[PDB]
């Protein structure tokens, strides 16, 4: 009967959180937020997130290395996400992916380190959390080359158009929708959740990044969730409960069913 939401995008221990991460993570069931999925991005920060998840029974773990830091992964990253995917409260690797827009690290870098996280969820059968800018066609490629986990996972933040939403979710991905999805300016990513529906989309806040609208300038954090719901419900014509209910069912499904 509840309108539970869930973040499937945090990154609870970024320094923006220092002065008050505990009121904001003991504030999650007054916030109607049923749990979030907190993200590392390299093997340092990958180990801050583990250890800030095992603090609080609403926070789950991913672990991955962000493509911007792919030049810097040493010999072994991948054994070591391994290993800390030996915790219970890790239910996905990420973030990885593609960034072709920053080009931080070098794309065939990228591509890479992209590939050995992927097959390295397709070992560990878990979900993928994965991060693409301006390279959905090369990601899309990379994917559909090798054996996925069971669950494929999100496509965190998707900012792409109508058609390219299609040919991820027919690959098995559910979309992440967050912030943005409520931006004046964002005509074209509302059209796309209009036409894709619930059935393949889960909510992200991405904080302490991208805020939603009545927010821009501040740092974003879970329980602003709610306006990303707002928008979606007015967008697809349906009670915000209907929104809640199908994103966090699909978010329960990807990271929280137990896996072979």
Known sequence: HHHHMVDTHAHLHFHQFDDDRNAVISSFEENNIEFVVNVGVNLEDSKKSLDLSKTSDRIFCSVGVHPH???????????????????????????????????????????????????LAGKLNLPLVVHIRDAYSEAYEILRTESLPEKRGVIHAFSSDYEWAKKFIDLGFLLGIGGPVTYPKNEALREVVKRVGLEYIVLETDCPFLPPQPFRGKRNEPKYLKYVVETISQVLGVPEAKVDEATTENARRIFLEVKE
């Open 69 to 119: 830091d792919a030049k810097e992964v040493p010999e072994d990253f991948i054994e070591h996400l391994e290993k800390f995917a030996k915790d219970e409260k890790v239910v996905a690797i990420g973030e990885t992916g593609l960034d072709f827009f920053r080009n931080i690290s070098p794309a065939e870098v990228q591509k890479r380190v992209f590939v050995e996280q992927i097959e």
